[model samples]
Target chain A: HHHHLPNITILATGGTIAGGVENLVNAVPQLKDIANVKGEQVVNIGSQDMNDNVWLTLAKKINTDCDKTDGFVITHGTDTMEETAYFLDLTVKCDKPVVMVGAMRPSTSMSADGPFNLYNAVVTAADKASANRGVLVVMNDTVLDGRDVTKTNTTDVATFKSVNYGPLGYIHNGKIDYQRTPARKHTSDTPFDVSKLNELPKVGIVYNYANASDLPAKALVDAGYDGIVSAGVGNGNLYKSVFDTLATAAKTGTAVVRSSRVPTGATTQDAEVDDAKYGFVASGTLNPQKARVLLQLALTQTKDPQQIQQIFNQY
Target chain B: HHHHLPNITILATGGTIAGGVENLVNAVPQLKDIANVKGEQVVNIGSQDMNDNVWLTLAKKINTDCDKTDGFVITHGTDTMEETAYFLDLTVKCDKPVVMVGAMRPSTSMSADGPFNLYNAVVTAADKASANRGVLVVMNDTVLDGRDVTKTNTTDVATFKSVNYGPLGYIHNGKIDYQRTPARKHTSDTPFDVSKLNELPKVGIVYNYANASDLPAKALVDAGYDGIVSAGVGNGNLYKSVFDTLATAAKTGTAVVRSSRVPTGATTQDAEVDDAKYGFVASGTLNPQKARVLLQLALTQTKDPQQIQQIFNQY
Candidate 1:
């Protein structure tokens, strides 16, 4: 063929998709139509077992190997795909398409979606238009930014979505009708770099509800964790006991962040909680899990609550 | 004028909205055009201070006063409005329109949103089309179902949204072109009756994240809580320690429900955790707080996990 094809690297991290498609590249013969592809097994496990160690490894690997590939496709489990996607969105500096793909059903299931999802991921990675779009999750023929896209269903193929904002675009017949992009800084624009670090600062999440317990916050505080994020009610208003605990933790120099249990909006500052007085930061639009990712990376550079708040504001 | 007007009762609850527009019905004299409006101070406190006692009182009030008023408009704080709205959705038996109204900005703020929101709430309450929609939240000229609507932004007037599904409809020029309704069983359709009871079953929410602790779950279990809802990671996957604590709690007769920390989507069963084996219930489509409300009510009827799961499935 007298045409150029993009070099796409498939970094397979085992999830339900991997369980169904053991040899992902071989299972999708049609991927060859769009790109020159090669596969590498990053690690195989249900994404629930995903940890910070794997996160460090993925970013380092992507940065170290960026010059060799046009784009990357990460096959992940749906359980914690949002976390990993947002993490890579912040840490991975490469502007080339870093698309994440997963399946709700294994290949063995009837009407499995892996083959098509995998095919589309490759197509998305090969397209030059996909570059500088932050990390992309291509599933069910929909394109979503890693920052806001999350798995919205337990077992549906159309589970991934941008819950707050809508999606970036839709893919039909191998072409994406690109539209809106994420407003937040990402990829090369972000300040996060995880290559040299061996371990991220430890952070734990505590939830709020009526008659909420403070033990989780206290436990994190006592364990001398670097940071704590509260998945609070409404606009990140903590339960009374939880508020007392997190407030004390903030005064004691442990970083505290308030993120909402309400799924869609920003956990803004200057509301009921005087964040400035307590040295606490609002998570903005990032959910508790995503906030933890930024807090961990933010802790890498500085621990000042103001600096952390600024980081939350920017990224 | 020989026109018969609907009697719309405004139950004012102290919130940021109430603070700005103290004389709510008077501030918007236009409400008199649509309905014979009356006002009641249900309570003057932030919705964050909203509790089961008030919830029961509101449900009882609406049920008892159903014959007197044609519809009800609730003025509440934006914080925890979703929780109250959902609580009413499942508990209130009245088929009359029960509309929730809140302002993201106070009356004193530039272009305050309270008056129009109040005016629209009266419009929605008076309209026959607004009935049986499962408690509508009227804000920023939008109508959302209580089952799916949530506070998306911390401080935007257009904060309330049906994150999973879009809004039921939008309000323009004081009229709503109603289209969709929530599918779940609600109001009189639900089995819960909180009228006679003075208290609800105790439910506490715990969060899941990387390096999460079991202290909170253990404290709830030790405190002999009736139910525990985990605001878990991704599609309701728990941290290892939280899973262990909740597994034991579920086995020992304390109800355990898995709700997602991710904002949108259902926390489905038969996936990451074995709901049947552990006596756990998956909080389908309910956020942790909403799950907590339902679990508290479910425990009032039965302690059986399977029955609770069935309730989770239905309402």
Candidate 2:
């Protein structure tokens, strides 16, 4: 009943345990010692089905309720959490801390991780040091920033990790040891705003491999899509067929960004593929999905490849 | 010279320090004390252009020369070295050590890592402990098994890493400390043989994202391809369009294997995807490219999804 506790709002989306917010709070009774927490239900579907509308809703919801709450903890599903985290990292205008948490195992399992993960997520959200660290994902006692963390394993609880960069910090026995914060501009500092936006611009990703087919690229271009992201070979190199098709698409005024399917690493600029000559942009470290998130937002601002490249380099 | 030094065959494919064997050996004079090495020139194209023909040639060459050489080191371009290593790992019948090496930087760079990397690769090839560790990639003084090693960074010297599993060992001052070898079936144990093969069966990879188009999947299906690998979203979950298209293709005799675009994990069977119901296969730890390699060879053996999944499980 002390008056100094931070008020943390738990935004429940989906991909969490079976019970609602009450069970999550009741399972971890120690959460009251750190912060006065409450839960609000958003979309309750699995996160693999998470879409652009849900993303826009979350962004606007957090932006609208920014001043009322000290912090926010999003209970999300793991499949596409990184994509949503990156989207909120860019779109949400709230300066308050936002933390994302998920459970790999269901609540019925022997040692379900949702209660502890949710507890630490609340602790992280209530902490003042987490305010400006961009959108954070607290899972398995490690604090991973949204920009680079991805689901590496399909079933392992310790699956979420950042390959290009290390974790921001780690949570121990109810305490966080912060190594550093994310260097990217996020939350209120980023220029993206979904407040007045209705829908995201069109973007699609294509894969490249030996003897790759160009019909995927042609399909997007024929539909007059706003942009295309090629999950190219090593260092953002495209297959011959994909290269030819995307080259034609770029010339026809579709924004083209070269990302990689190789997982980690920056899809470097102009290494072998001449980005300037072909008017293509290289995704420095953004994986295909996160690159699609930024590309859709960048297209909302400008369709120019030069401007999109700058947006990619900055955020 | 003492007769105790092992004879290591240097198979030069491409993407090394740019000079041939003389420059590589002369640059590292201490290699003579470790092994008596000689060089053989294969194709010299960039590894980005590496294809099935090169893979066939390497596997055939290694199989034919197995009895003559004590060990073999292939100087490869870093772009697709992991793919080639895994390809050779499964196809080559040689029990001798096979190490793949590449240069992350050009020879003209200030601190080029090729000479030292090549030296350590030779050191690794000469060691008998590396004989059955699958095809090894010696980069940045670390020995990574080809089954899981991939290029993570575009330009970083320390780009090659095995994400699913850890490295076999690390080399220091021309000596490698022994730890453990690869547990996967490789070398003479694998059932794949490409001695007289003219070409590999056609297999293509498609990407999955939110609202992903089905044209890529349809294109491969329409083209009468032998197999298709989907680089799906988290845990190999497919996009709606791609999922539907691949489902139809799987029922109609085209082999469909699910892999993930997320770098490290194994796409567990029957997680979200019903493999038994849809006649689909799951790539446990292999990425899309390596999955394609195994799928092509599996097609050569049998086109049954059950048999292909068993092939994926074994290799």
Candidate 3:
């Protein structure tokens, strides 16, 4: 207990980083020399099948179990991993480091990435400098914000991309180097609570295209959906027919939010379409998928469209 | 008529590049001295209002008039400019350089980007080294492939991004520095013939999210859409409900293609979803909007899904 090494927890969530006959820390035995590390198996499933239950479980564990540790590292599957990072960032209620690490190739694969990624994740988490910066995705030798990073590739080992907002820092050798901190609200500052909830609200996303019709919007509305987000065209412009139907649905109490199908850029308010006039909210920089996650949490608190719009603007 | 000057045509299709009292050439008087330049105004509108008619007219002019010139530069708005660049890349019918240039800030603004961007575009177009390399977008002193670049930011001058693929080259201090070439079919090698065509086929894109419904797919099918591209989540995955509707739509003779909602990955064939079994095509690295443009052109030649799939694989 009096050892000089930083105490860190390795939470394994069943990704390629833990694919071999050994656990994450064992796959990379070299990681133990970096910190006083303890490994725990949280779950072992592909991130594609991740759901709200897993998110709540992970949030509660990080809150209660890891309270004495200096930091924590989560080994996860690449697919849908960013969503988990974002979820944890909003609900973990901590100022300590939470670095999510994963590998594209399995532990048994040729030139495996698990060892290197796990090693970096451990060092990044153990560093006191990484605290109070929200949850980070550590992969491909880059430190990225959970709110901005996304899994951008299907097979490439170096696939996590920050898009318009570049990486916050890089992992060179065995050091943690930071470039800038994100300006958004996150971590313990967020108002999200998941200790008592069993599930998130059901939210749907409808993508926009040329000559798009209103059938999808009507279907979601008829299905008694609480909220709908549109993955609209440039600047989040929607087809007239689809927008009119969604506007009519908005009048009937279903919340509508607009986001861009394009990868980057904020969907500006009232740029191309009359969002305020239609009681529609603009997803500032959140993509449709991420917007759905935020909307579900927002709807659990209030059904007012304007109040939800304020949440989108802030978070 | 050989005056030893590389004749470059500056085709002004309005954007922030031509948003002030002066034309593009006037804003950058140094560009006039770069070559025997001829300025022509094609259309003066934001790229958000861009449609197929402008594409057809632009392609026709580039084919007929620019065939004799050394190179051509098209000044355009940043938004949807990549669509026009790809349109010209496929149907321009020439090996000479054709660069699409735009600026984020208007000419009337302080420290406007138009002057430097126009100068770089002229220099890049006039360079003989850019021959047979497909249409290029020159902005922020970088050379990018027309097929791969997309607007990644709403307000930054360095907005155009090539996603997984990086820029082709860069222009530094009036010098054109070369990088790698793209391995796609383009220019005269492409099968697209837009000279005699007045319009393209009706193709649409459907966005996807968690719990996404099939209403949009049904609407497109009922509207007699020739093709549909799903901007689905990670690796172009569709929810069971949305996939079922799209599969049924595909059975009814509508071409269905799968593209990723995630920004930078190729939708591999039969990766997570059995695309081959479902009679659907994969968009590879093409995003939804570019996939829509390609699908529209592909429908002009054939309706066979296999043939269209081959086309997607190639160009």
Candidate 4:
């Protein structure tokens, strides 16, 4: 009996989807009819403990596994799930669908969200229409960018959110529907090569506050930080003390990027502080944690502030 | 000219709405025909320069002038407009409409938004539907809770946003339309009283980031700040270093509040961290800055962590 079906792999990482979980082979037998599906356990730890090691391991596995499959699905914990999704988006050199799924409630909890999220993730990955849209984070029936999505709630199932932009698409009735294209480089389009790297560069973020002292910035510099992103106030504004401290750090060849403490909005160039004159980079629409992710990779490529700023503006 | 009309005062605080602008009383002559309007200039500066002095003066003026008029209108800059609106929402002890209006573009610019924003603000204030809703921010044809609205753009007309929850209502075709009611305490329902106060207590916000250092928390604690709000990461999470330092601060009789750096979602208690165990207060849906505003007023009333947490839970 010859049957034509798109082959897909579900990469299970330790998250609520796998927390107190059941058999993927039979629990959702409907997934078998959707695509030729197989499941692999990469790691089984809460997302809070996710690290660079797991990311490198996952990227290597995907490159090898994704070629044999039409698409891929990942079950991850909501906490730091956005970080993992973005990391995979940047590193896993592939155009095939890669959807990260998670649930806020554990699998044993009443009204658990794991089963539906995992089902939709597989459906999304199996769809041929999901190609070339960067890595997608699918949960609660919404499709969001790995680059832009963040865990908004602590325990609510509908935790993932993209504040500035809405969802990239939606999965309704086991079908893939798209709305807007995210305006960022991803997949093989980006120059990131993680297959050969063992570790990412060290980057730290300095949160801004009203009348904040420069002790934190000084501490990072003294700790031999490779890059620093200042999460500044409104429109990524730095306190006077913070600006002076970061300016001093900039002269010492340490890359400094400015991002906003505000949840939404782009930290534009030359708005409050002069990024060009100060030799600092603005995070654009990327928040502090994401800014750190890009800066870590960006520093691995170049130390030039202008080149780094260009990378930020593009990505 | 003696026609029966509702008398509403336009309290003009110099923002883009009042910057190089004409008289709204005459420009929108229909406004003059709708209500007997009188204009007064409170301040003539950008909202970024807005401080406690201005907030106090504005609150006092509203308490007095709102009594003599059917409603009140405030034309302010968009930068710190949300803070001012929230301040009035907590302190202004009247149910009459207090509509704060601002523009993203300057008055002289092409397709300037000041006139229309001012017009809608007047309309909203004049309508009886706006009463009992606390201070309302009218911009981009939407009415938002002063506690919920934030300036989300650096230079766009649709900059103001209410994260998670949407606007309270919208204005269409010069008419006021009502929608969902925010579930929180507001004017006439709150315990805040600013009539006899010369100045509010000092509350500082500490931004949280990846690998964040605790030096800022120590500095804030040492600076004799009355209260501190940690603008924490993902569901109001604090790095180990930040958590330890802030925990120490909390034990030192300083009120510690936890809010999220993520724009939307409630910072629920005991979801990620044990707030009761650490004596930290969660900001719920209030952002760090707004939490600071509430904390300042709460400290003025009581210093007990339990009491302050109760206040946060209510408002």
Candidate 5:
């Protein structure tokens, strides 16, 4: 709504990009600002609040107010930047580029990189090519696809990166180098709708060790979570003990999505007797935390295990 | 060597695809009956025997025997497919299609899906289009670029999946319907020399949990491990206690790689204190276990953390 920046919309989600620190070089994006920044709208939703609908609401409202602007750039904490980027990629069907960027160092820091990242983001958004694609996370002088870009290093200025897929392009000098072909599935600029989301169901993750403890599983169950994401052993294989607790959680109607604690590979649902027989869904490439977010979104549609499993499979 | 079905090299390293179980629908791929297998060039190696140099040896042999086949498929345990796939993708400079596929269910189980997956894989390997692009992992009728695929689910027939990046194609109706592109720096049949490597050093993975125990870190150090992978908490963080213990371990010349225990998101090396301040390098998208495998392969060349981190970043 401001007159200076061509009706540009900024959705500020406090992170190291927004915090105040003495030295920019040592900015930690997830640090909760100790210096009081007064305002109710300035909510203290940490990085974990990534799936919160509040974000969608704010983005939608800002988008509506700034109708003249063709794009939006979100300022978020760096913690769940990738997850949120992916989420926006899926839900925010828009031709106008929705750039999401953040910093590790606080603005108060001596060598804060957030402002540069933000500036590049702004410049990138204002440009013509930043439109027609899906949401993007511009940082480290690189323009990465929303879903492809991931935060690799915490403090390094050039932290955000694309995994094996590589970056779509980069921001060299001051101009942007965009190399996106047409496979991206984003639609036109639609309203960001998080208010439609009802609840963020609890999802639990169980870790496996040589002789893993039962206390973690017990604690999760005792806490009465809505869903559980089991981080089982090799190829999603858990000891008999993990199966028992997971089974109990499943029987309680809590959505139990099984994922591997192992570094990589898929969790075979029908592969495990307990998981296949007990209606446990596999969290394919999605791990416990990401599974939690996906499960939370899936639950908004249905509770049937089969349907949920299908959603898990496709998504 | 025994008989070439259109000359498709099958490198079997034990998994559910080779496991024997009656009436199995889907289960862990365990290789306990290699002697009975007809065509597979079985290479008996434990999943953790990554430093054994078996992969390089086998890859060299396969390259030498390139005249016999149109492509190659490496059958391995699902526990570290992503790791092995990435390693192969980075080093194997080939133009021929090289695919890695395995089943989660034993052959004896009624739910075993390995045979079908392997059969499809054979077809894929022989396909000219499947080659020289990147290393790939084909499972559950999905053809994923090796660089993109990650083991996600703990238990499910359809487990090995690329999180945000979908599959390159599919093996359905007895054919490959290629969709996505394979992103590989160097791969099978390409003009490169991964065979020149002789020995690979050890790399370890340190697990993280609440009220974290330092046993794994201690054990790896005691076991003469050359590197340690800390599967830390949110944003690659660690409890203060584990952080100190790992810092000490790093001071001992062992390469320490920090990766997230969480299934999704990248581990930020510079953002988190343990990874940034300590000498630990973050395994961005590489899951801890998979990162260790890559680290081991990388160690075959260098021991410097800086070089190792570069390898971690690039491949």
Candidate 6:
């Protein structure tokens, strides 16, 4: 069982996969040593403290650290996992397998499940056939393409599920059983390159509710924000007040990117709001927070909605 | 101009397209008389309160209300407009045109542009050929396949944008142009029929954060929720506390539907969280709320996660 397989570098980004509890009352999850799990650890980052800069730096470090590595598995905090996956999918170079995994509960829990998840992730990464699948995501015994995998629940052992599309395959008894390699948009093959991106643009997310105020938006514009991601209600509907401020700010050279606070479904741009007419970019599947991050990265290279959208769309 | 044209019933779902200023201090939108435009009653059912379980109810009423109606147009709010469109696309027995429209700005504002939207909708609805095109979403002067056109912008006059596809055609200078036909899962199509849907199941949404309170999960279970849509963070990572409650509740007949709070991507449900492997009914495309709605509807006929997941995957 210990016959040397193509070594896969595991990046433990803090989650229940690497989390442990000190006591019953305290629920804070702390990181675990990846080397303890029988894999080489290039980076063990806590999800909260890791932003775009940290992510890029870490990815670069991993790229530089690993040699003879057949694939890469990132263990990240579930909070911003999709953001990181999408970010990596857009930037990480290679046709090799790249997977992300996490746990809903800490390793010390009564029903701890980190070991199983890590084992399957290791197996998935070792399978060289999963290359160019656009960042595969393995969780709860299923393997999903990274771009298609999103966080669907707050707390559930089997929290990760594939939407719009299902998993590429399933894992059974610690063995990679099936594979569905459909076409993906932001794979390592995409033409848009983020290698030149160093400093990210400052993007702000404004939430929309029943009766939202406009101060939040005003503050972002005053802060000299490079882009704005408006997290609107259903179908991306914004409050009347916030909509006005957004429209006004867009004229001031601030790139306006629209994404929904509501999960899933593409925000209707033409009629749901006058975004296209106002020269704002519409993010499909890119949630408000993720939109903010992507907008920042896109702004670093381009400001035109068409150009920005191409970057967002292709990746 | 007075010549009688074919009857085209426009059913208005409350939105900026049919909203008027309540007062100068605050622009709370209220329904406006649709016929007041040309000093004539052009259509029946001025505005709709969609929450009244009236979308289908009104569709049936339209059949009896307008005998000569060649087609129908529904103006809806941006919020949950896609669900309504999906509903109409699946239910409405009539083969006549059913085009839905909404605006980002209310008619009371200086740039209030509902009239043009209304005009284009009428033109498209009146076109007999529009029938069997499935439910159409006409906004921002574009006629899109209801199935493909999702509201992307949170707020802007032009919000409805197509994803993985584009509009069926565009409306320009009071003319109707058909660039293509939409291939959507409509009433005649789709494995699960929407007409049979009655008494939607109890569904709930749970957020995943560092220390998300489990009270929401407890409250939902206490309130007798049949299903829960968990908006898990990246790749569906859940707080251990929340995951425990959900797992407990699921065994007690509460179905745990997995969705991502990350906005885009689906859940990969094979990765482990505990010794006892966890599972989630992947909610694709439909966000937490919409997933809850879809799951509730699916639960009315069956409780099988595979069937429910199929329904979720189909849309």
Candidate 2 chain B weakest ten by summed lDDT: B15-24
| DockQ result, candidate 4 | 0.25
Clashes of each: 3, 0, 1, 0, 65, 64
Q: Model 5 reaches what TM-score against the true structure?
A: 0.51
Using all chains and alpha carbons, the TM-scores for the candidates as numbered come to: 0.88, 0.92, 0.82, 0.84, 0.51, 0.52
Question: What fraction of the true interface contacts does model 1 reproduce?
Answer: 0.46
Q: Which lDDT value does model 2 have at B281? A: 95
Model 6 regions lying over 4 Å from their true place: A1-3, A15-46, A177-179, A191-198, B1-315
Candidate 3 contains a number of clashing pairs equal to 1
Task: Give me the chain B TM-score of candidate 4.
Answer: 0.94
CAPRI-style quality class for the chain A–B interface of candidate 5 = incorrect
Better of 1 and 5 by DockQ: 1
Model 2 TM-score on a 0 to 1 scale: 0.92
TM-score of candidate 6 chain A against the true chain A: 0.85
lDDT of 4 at A203: 77
lDDT (tens digit, per residue) of candidate 4 on B122-214: 888988888888899999999998888987665678878887688989889878778876778988788898878888777777666544557
Chain A, model 4: TM: 0.94
Cα lDDT over the full model 6: 0.62
Q: Score the docking of each candidate (DockQ).
A: 0.40, 0.49, 0.29, 0.25, 0.04, 0.09
Sorted by DockQ (best first), the order is 2, 1, 3, 4, 6, 5
Candidate rank order under lDDT: 2, 1, 3, 4, 5, 6
Candidate 6 lDDT over residue span A111-205, tens digit each: 77665776677677777666667777778888877665666554566767666467888887645666466564664465545555565667756
Instruction: Pick the winner on DockQ between candidates 2 and 5.
Output: 2
lDDT of each: 0.84, 0.86, 0.80, 0.79, 0.65, 0.62
The sequence of per-residue lDDT tens digits that candidate 5 reaches over residues B1-315 is 665334555666754464422211223222112111224545666565644476676667666766665677777877777877877776665567778877677667886787778767766786677765588888988788776588778768888887635566656445564534643245543333567667667776777888888777888888888888878787678777778777988878778887788886567554636454667787776677777767776666777877877777666
Name the runs in model 1 displaced over 4 angstroms. A1-7, A15-22, A64-70, A93-97, A127-134, A153-158, A162-191, B1-4, B16-22, B63-70, B93-97, B127-134, B140-144, B162-183, B209-211, B233-235
